[PDB]
Design an enzyme around this catalytic site. Sequence first.
Site, PDB file in Angstrom:
ATOM      1  N   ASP A  62       7.527   9.386   2.407  1.00  0.00           N
ATOM      2  CA  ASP A  62       6.678   8.323   2.420  1.00  0.00           C
ATOM      3  C   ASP A  62       5.597   7.472   1.674  1.00  0.00           C
ATOM      4  OD1 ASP A  62       6.487   6.312   4.101  1.00  0.00           O
ATOM      5  OD2 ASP A  62       4.037   6.205   3.755  1.00  0.00           O
TER       6      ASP A  62
ATOM      7  N   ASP B 210       2.465  11.477   0.045  1.00  0.00           N
ATOM      8  CA  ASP B 210       2.120  11.924   0.303  1.00  0.00           C
ATOM      9  C   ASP B 210       3.550  12.535   0.579  1.00  0.00           C
ATOM     10  OD1 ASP B 210       3.435  10.047   2.164  1.00  0.00           O
ATOM     11  OD2 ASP B 210       2.607  10.774   4.144  1.00  0.00           O
TER      12      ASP B 210
ATOM     13  N   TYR C 139       2.272   4.629  11.623  1.00  0.00           N
ATOM     14  CA  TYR C 139       3.435   3.918  11.287  1.00  0.00           C
ATOM     15  C   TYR C 139       3.490   3.669  12.448  1.00  0.00           C
ATOM     16  CZ  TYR C 139       4.031   4.140   6.479  1.00  0.00           C
ATOM     17  OH  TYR C 139       3.468   4.105   4.985  1.00  0.00           O
TER      18      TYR C 139
ATOM     19  N   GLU D  16      -2.509   3.083  -3.795  1.00  0.00           N
ATOM     20  CA  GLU D  16      -1.335   3.131  -2.393  1.00  0.00           C
ATOM     21  C   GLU D  16      -0.257   2.767  -2.884  1.00  0.00           C
ATOM     22  OE1 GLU D  16      -0.665   5.759  -1.192  1.00  0.00           O
ATOM     23  OE2 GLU D  16      -1.286   5.829   1.068  1.00  0.00           O
TER      24      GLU D  16
HETATM   25  O1  LIG Z   1      -1.265  -8.045  14.741  1.00  0.00           O
HETATM   26  C1  LIG Z   1      -0.822  -8.698  13.237  1.00  0.00           C
HETATM   27  C2  LIG Z   1      -0.056  -8.188  13.254  1.00  0.00           C
HETATM   28  O2  LIG Z   1       0.570  -6.924  13.142  1.00  0.00           O
HETATM   29  C3  LIG Z   1       1.066  -5.599  12.362  1.00  0.00           C
HETATM   30  O3  LIG Z   1       1.641  -4.788  12.294  1.00  0.00           O
HETATM   31  C4  LIG Z   1       0.775  -4.107  11.212  1.00  0.00           C
HETATM   32  C5  LIG Z   1      -0.434  -3.334  11.832  1.00  0.00           C
HETATM   33  O4  LIG Z   1      -1.250  -4.532  12.550  1.00  0.00           O
HETATM   34  C6  LIG Z   1      -1.379  -2.639  10.580  1.00  0.00           C
HETATM   35  O5  LIG Z   1      -2.795  -2.540  10.996  1.00  0.00           O
HETATM   36  C7  LIG Z   1      -0.588  -2.499   9.710  1.00  0.00           C
HETATM   37  O6  LIG Z   1      -1.001  -1.492   8.957  1.00  0.00           O
HETATM   38  C8  LIG Z   1      -0.668  -0.597   7.989  1.00  0.00           C
HETATM   39  C9  LIG Z   1      -0.093  -0.684   6.248  1.00  0.00           C
HETATM   40  O7  LIG Z   1       1.341  -1.487   7.181  1.00  0.00           O
HETATM   41  C10 LIG Z   1       0.600   0.906   6.264  1.00  0.00           C
HETATM   42  O8  LIG Z   1       0.664   0.601   4.385  1.00  0.00           O
HETATM   43  C11 LIG Z   1      -0.623   1.450   6.063  1.00  0.00           C
HETATM   44  O9  LIG Z   1      -0.525   2.787   5.160  1.00  0.00           O
HETATM   45  O10 LIG Z   1      -1.641   1.744   7.315  1.00  0.00           O
HETATM   46  C12 LIG Z   1      -2.007   0.687   7.914  1.00  0.00           C
HETATM   47  C13 LIG Z   1      -2.759   0.844   8.685  1.00  0.00           C
HETATM   48  O11 LIG Z   1      -1.931   1.591   9.903  1.00  0.00           O
HETATM   49  O12 LIG Z   1       0.486  -3.174   8.999  1.00  0.00           O
HETATM   50  C14 LIG Z   1       1.214  -3.301  10.580  1.00  0.00           C
HETATM   51  C15 LIG Z   1       2.747  -4.581   9.865  1.00  0.00           C
HETATM   52  O13 LIG Z   1       2.630  -4.736   8.707  1.00  0.00           O
HETATM   53  C16 LIG Z   1       2.686  -6.423  13.156  1.00  0.00           C
HETATM   54  O14 LIG Z   1       4.086  -5.836  12.673  1.00  0.00           O
HETATM   55  C17 LIG Z   1       3.192  -7.523  13.410  1.00  0.00           C
HETATM   56  O15 LIG Z   1       3.618  -7.761  14.187  1.00  0.00           O
HETATM   57  C18 LIG Z   1       2.065  -8.854  13.560  1.00  0.00           C
HETATM   58  O16 LIG Z   1       1.889  -9.832  13.684  1.00  0.00           O
HETATM   59  O1  LIG Z   2      -4.881   7.540   5.798  1.00  0.00           O
HETATM   60  C1  LIG Z   2      -4.606   6.790   4.569  1.00  0.00           C
HETATM   61  C2  LIG Z   2      -4.700   7.523   3.725  1.00  0.00           C
HETATM   62  O2  LIG Z   2      -5.033   9.095   3.767  1.00  0.00           O
HETATM   63  C3  LIG Z   2      -4.988   9.896   3.091  1.00  0.00           C
HETATM   64  O3  LIG Z   2      -5.376  11.308   3.251  1.00  0.00           O
HETATM   65  C4  LIG Z   2      -6.993  11.619   3.447  1.00  0.00           C
HETATM   66  C5  LIG Z   2      -6.776  12.625   4.536  1.00  0.00           C
HETATM   67  O4  LIG Z   2      -6.799  11.112   5.569  1.00  0.00           O
HETATM   68  C6  LIG Z   2      -8.443  13.583   4.780  1.00  0.00           C
HETATM   69  O5  LIG Z   2      -8.028  14.031   5.424  1.00  0.00           O
HETATM   70  C7  LIG Z   2      -8.604  13.807   2.978  1.00  0.00           C
HETATM   71  O6  LIG Z   2      -9.987  14.061   3.450  1.00  0.00           O
HETATM   72  O7  LIG Z   2      -8.839  12.589   1.956  1.00  0.00           O
HETATM   73  C8  LIG Z   2      -7.165  12.446   2.220  1.00  0.00           C
HETATM   74  C9  LIG Z   2      -7.829  11.414   0.545  1.00  0.00           C
HETATM   75  O8  LIG Z   2      -7.928  10.176   1.065  1.00  0.00           O
HETATM   76  C10 LIG Z   2      -3.534   9.378   2.319  1.00  0.00           C
HETATM   77  O9  LIG Z   2      -3.499  10.819   1.359  1.00  0.00           O
HETATM   78  C11 LIG Z   2      -2.625   8.364   1.652  1.00  0.00           C
HETATM   79  O10 LIG Z   2      -1.676   8.926   1.911  1.00  0.00           O
HETATM   80  C12 LIG Z   2      -3.026   7.735   3.012  1.00  0.00           C
HETATM   81  O11 LIG Z   2      -2.572   6.764   3.177  1.00  0.00           O
END
Ligand SMILES: OC[C@H]1O[C@@H](O[C@H]2[C@H](O)[C@@H](O)[C@H](O[C@H]3[C@H](O)[C@@H](O)[C@H](O)O[C@@H]3CO)O[C@@H]2CO)[C@H](O)[C@@H](O)[C@@H]1O
Ligand SMILES: OC[C@H]1O[C@@H](O[C@H]2[C@H](O)[C@@H](O)[C@H](O)O[C@@H]2CO)[C@H](O)[C@@H](O)[C@@H]1O
Lengths: 599, 599
Positions: A47, A50, A188, A406
């Site tokens: 993804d 990771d 997700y 990231e």
């Molecule tokens: O409520 C406002 C909007 O929220 C949208 O979903 C988002 C989450 O609120 C947000 O926390 C989340 O974040 C992710 C990020 O997308 C990702 O790159 C990262 O690794 O993890 C983050 C933490 O989970 O993103 C989502 C989507 O953008 C709703 O989709 C939307 O309907 C709503 O308006």
């Molecule tokens: O989930 C956020 C972010 O986490 C990253 O991993 C951490 C992990 O959560 C923790 O257990 C470790 O001790 O440190 C690593 C590095 O920050 C992960 O690498 C990311 O993909 C992710 O966005």
Amino acid sequence: SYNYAEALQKAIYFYECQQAGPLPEWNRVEWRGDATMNDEVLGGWYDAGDHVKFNLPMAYSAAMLGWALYEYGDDIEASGQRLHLERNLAFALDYLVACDRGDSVVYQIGDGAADHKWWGSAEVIEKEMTRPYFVGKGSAVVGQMAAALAVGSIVLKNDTYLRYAKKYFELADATRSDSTYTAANGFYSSHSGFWDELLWASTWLYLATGDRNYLDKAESYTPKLNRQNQTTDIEYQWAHCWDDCHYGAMILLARATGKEEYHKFAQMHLDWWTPQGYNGKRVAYTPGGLAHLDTWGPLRYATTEAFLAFVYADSINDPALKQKYYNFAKSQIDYALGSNPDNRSYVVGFGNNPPQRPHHRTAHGTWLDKRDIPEKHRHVLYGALVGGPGRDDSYEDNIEDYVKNEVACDYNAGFVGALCRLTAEYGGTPLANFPPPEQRDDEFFVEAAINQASDHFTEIKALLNNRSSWPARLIKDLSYNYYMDLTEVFEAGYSVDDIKVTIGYCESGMDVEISPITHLYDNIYYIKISYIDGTNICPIGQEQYAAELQFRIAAPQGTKFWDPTNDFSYQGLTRELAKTKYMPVFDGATKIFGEVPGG
Amino acid sequence: SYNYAEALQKAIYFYECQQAGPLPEWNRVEWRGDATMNDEVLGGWYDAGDHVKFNLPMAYSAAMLGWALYEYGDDIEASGQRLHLERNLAFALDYLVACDRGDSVVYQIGDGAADHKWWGSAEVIEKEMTRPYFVGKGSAVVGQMAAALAVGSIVLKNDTYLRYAKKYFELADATRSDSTYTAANGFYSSHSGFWDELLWASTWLYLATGDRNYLDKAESYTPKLNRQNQTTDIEYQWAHCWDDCHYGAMILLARATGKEEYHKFAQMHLDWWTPQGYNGKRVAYTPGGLAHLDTWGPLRYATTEAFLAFVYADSINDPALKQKYYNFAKSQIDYALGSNPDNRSYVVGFGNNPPQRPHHRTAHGTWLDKRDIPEKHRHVLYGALVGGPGRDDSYEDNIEDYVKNEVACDYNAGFVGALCRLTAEYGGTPLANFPPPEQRDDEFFVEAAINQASDHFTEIKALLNNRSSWPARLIKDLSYNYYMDLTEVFEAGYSVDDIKVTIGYCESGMDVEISPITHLYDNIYYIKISYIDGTNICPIGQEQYAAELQFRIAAPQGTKFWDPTNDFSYQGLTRELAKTKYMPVFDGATKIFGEVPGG
Ligand SMILES: OC[C@H]1O[C@@H](O[C@H]2[C@H](O)[C@@H](O)[C@H](O[C@H]3[C@H](O)[C@@H](O)[C@H](O)O[C@@H]3CO)O[C@@H]2CO)[C@H](O)[C@@H](O)[C@@H]1O
Ligand SMILES: OC[C@H]1O[C@@H](O[C@H]2[C@H](O)[C@@H](O)[C@H](O)O[C@@H]2CO)[C@H](O)[C@@H](O)[C@@H]1O
Ligand SMILES: OC[C@H]1O[C@@H](O[C@H]2[C@H](O)[C@@H](O)[C@H](O[C@H]3[C@H](O)[C@@H](O)[C@H](O)O[C@@H]3CO)O[C@@H]2CO)[C@H](O)[C@@H](O)[C@@H]1O
Ligand SMILES: OC[C@H]1O[C@@H](O[C@H]2[C@H](O)[C@@H](O)[C@H](O)O[C@@H]2CO)[C@H](O)[C@@H](O)[C@@H]1O
Ligand SMILES: [Br-]
Ligand SMILES: [Br-]
Ligand SMILES: [Br-]
Ligand SMILES: [Br-]
Ligand SMILES: [Br-]
Ligand SMILES: [Br-]
Ligand SMILES: [Ca+2]
Ligand SMILES: [Ca+2]
Ligand SMILES: [Ca+2]
Ligand SMILES: [Ca+2]
Ligand SMILES: [Cl-]
Ligand SMILES: [Cl-]
Ligand SMILES: [Cl-]
Ligand SMILES: [Cl-]
Ligand SMILES: [Cl-]
Ligand SMILES: [Cl-]
């Protein structure tokens, strides 16, 4: 401006860096090998930085790649990138088909917590952990999978993808529940619900088949969409993204039906993204001109919006609206490529002062389960769009910052479509000899030190290293040799059996043998140290990357003749651990590092 | 009341337990060998439950043993103990002579802090630490050494002892300072000052030589003695002890000169110790009847005063005073022997319910630097008078209580002289077969466990133990054998050369080799594990008392014949570590533990 063709070239290559095993023969990444070969479903993409296969953002990303080809595939032939994009997309779609389990699908490979706890290269992760899989029928994840295959079937002219797209859609649409979607929680999670994915999938199936039954389905989902706050409008204050594709589905429905409601939505939403806003309401903008939706991956959101904006503008005739949407779109892409207060690219290996420390395990190439060592990345993750700066344009290139640094499938996906649009318009010439070869380090070698020395013995501390990275890999039949000269022992009136081989320390769990002292030629002799399962020497941690042996070769006690100064493998050794070429390493009978007496 | 001859017999044997190396031929302690052979000055006694040589109490103890002989030597010939007492005294005096450095003496061997941090046996302490020595000319320590040699020279009729008594006395009397006596601070600090030692030494030199000049000297020191609190009297409210011998000196001068000042002092001092006290002042008494000077070594103080009381009563004629002092003396000794609220002996290995957990390293016999393991002492410290009970007669026999269950040279010294006086009067018959032999446990042996079993290999975890205690000792050429029956190998068509020996772990710092598989007879074969310097397997701590090796004996991967159930050395092994007799241990070519196939 920028070389948009070069940026697209690299942006596509990024997906080759993310491929799980088995790799296709066409993979261009010299530091990637077959990895995670014991996964319940093979192929597909890791993804982010990771090694989890998360099917929601994976399928999203493939759907966006298919969308790019659908809009602009003919328009990018000049750049030579069309075939690269096509085969990179099939690679992911093949994975989605392979997830089929009849009444459900495999929707995840990897436990996210355990995967994230470890820092190291893809190809060696199975030495650290067993990877579970997860099966279910969540409507969001299965619907996004259907969507990806539907657009895929069109741009790749493939009946199989279409058949799976339909099957997955019926499954998501029968299930109408994300309750079997659990394993991605907190990574997700389905925030918006699944109605948007049913809309997006059925829209693409309508575009793929022309069957108005799918148009009827699609339109029947729009009253189920979330509202903007407490109003009656469909939510528009957000980005098309891995969790919510209703935005782009509305744009696609605008062009396919020409109906007023979809254009009103499109322009309401797109207006809110522009600096001019929608009735006084607008996305946050940095002073530097970035539309900044959220802390997490703001460039991902803005570059995806640039794509939607290009597609909507290309589909209408009003020059005022076209210019406004085109200028918004290009401005976001150009920010990402360098038009920002630091004049720096936010794309790895592209443009001026690009990020050099993306939060990406395999590109980093450590041997130690550490992020700070090595202090520079061993590989170039060409094309990867980073998270991006804060609301205030602030940014540091730091491997620890998984918010700003990231990288991910979903970051690159809409960005690729936008770059297709800009290449189509401005052309550009892709790099001729890309990717160029990396400077490599030694991968398998002994580090040695004189542990103890006396006038009747030599004791050696030897650590046999696996710091492989081109690609990281395992070698079972590892050995190395210690070469000696026994001239002084014979000249003093002693023989070979006056010399005894002992062990002073053998690392736990490294099943090891040492040969008898063996004649090479003249007075030159050696011992071989062999690891029975050399795969346990691997770059997955502080203890595992090297196997430690302390061995002693001794003349009879009290005697004074032993002279290690003429021994081949003693050359250059000190009291301090150092790499040496004079203790050569073998894979079976083949020497893979170092030098031998004579040849 | 008690078999006093037996108590005396045992009390003397205690000093043989204390002897440093080289031990005399006549040493009767089966669990003591030559120890601390690298000391700057050899012989002498370890002070207490430790292994420091502290010259002040050592010499004080010698002077007291000399005094016992001086008073009651002819009277104890019936006990059979005179010769035993005499050569034991000679052992310590020889050490004091060997301490001579001309203008200074060696006054200590071992650092108290360093020595006491470790818990283990005398004979293995050099594997643990390196012992310092200390030189100086402290008047108290040099004075006490002179006194011991002066009395020794009389009772053992020895011109060399007299010569060195004179040497040391002249050094102590010219120096008049404790400033260079620092190494025992906190253990045996000079609290009283040095005037008492000069008085004690010069008194004994006078008794040895008859030279009037030593008398004048002795008398000239009396005005320099510490006063009792704010008053005019010489201090009397303590005991004759390692720090302060003015008490016994005044008793000696009372008898030698008949002067009233000395008789007055002795009676005041002894009255303060008796139940009637001295004009309303008295030592603390437990309800059970022990004069209790201090929480530290109360039996030591009371029993030493018993001896002084006996000597003074035997030297006067007043019937009331004689009876008062004799009753006091015998009551202190009898308390120590079992006339107490618990009816129990406080002398190890004597009488009813004696202490069994004295605070004594070598008598305990650990292999891992712990007081609590083993939970019973391995050896009997016959004759040792422990510290004794609290002020309320309470006591528990606990190895950890170094106040109540400490043992020492000075604890036994006055005690011996009081037991001489009692056996002189009541006789008694010493034990004919003393000491009887101890029950031993196994000292060198393998603990093994099946570390992993497979259909083509056996892997063993083996720990070669040194828990020696009779005496604790070091063996260099240690090895053990693993015996197999290879019948199934040959029946399946394979040879010895198809069987591979590897190592999965070898403890750091244990130089080891393993023989090729070797023919015994018929289809019985073995491998010999040999430790080149086995003295590193030693009972000095948790890591040291055993060497761990994990070895694997393997038929080729894929074969199905391997059968450990017919291997001699596999018999009885489980997945947990346990002592095994079927992996015999050898010292060079001599089997020291276990069984061999066909024998
Ligand atoms: O409520 C406002 C909007 O929220 C949208 O979903 C988002 C989450 O609120 C947000 O926390 C989340 O974040 C992710 C990020 O997308 C990702 O790159 C990262 O690794 O993890 C983050 C933490 O989970 O993103 C989502 C989507 O953008 C709703 O989709 C939307 O309907 C709503 O308006
Ligand atoms: O989930 C956020 C972010 O986490 C990253 O991993 C951490 C992990 O959560 C923790 O257990 C470790 O001790 O440190 C690593 C590095 O920050 C992960 O690498 C990311 O993909 C992710 O966005
Ligand atoms: O102050 C009163 C008397 O003290 C005598 O000194 C003693 C110290 O006060 C006492 O602390 C010391 O205790 C020893 C103990 O004897 C020993 O067995 C143990 O291992 O360590 C303790 C700390 O060294 O004992 C001495 C000697 O009794 C003076 O000698 C005396 O003149 C004075 O009045
Ligand atoms: O000096 C008091 C007493 O100490 C005992 O040694 C201690 C040692 O000081 C400490 O470092 C360790 O943790 O425990 C031991 C045992 O209590 C010493 O054994 C005695 O001889 C001494 O009298
Ligand atoms: Br399910
Ligand atoms: Br290039
Ligand atoms: Br070579
Ligand atoms: Br007996
Ligand atoms: Br077989
Ligand atoms: Br036998
Ligand atoms: Ca959704
Ligand atoms: Ca040599
Ligand atoms: Ca003194
Ligand atoms: Ca067998
Ligand atoms: Cl880089
Ligand atoms: Cl580095
Ligand atoms: Cl000095
Ligand atoms: Cl009385
Ligand atoms: Cl005992
Ligand atoms: Cl025990």
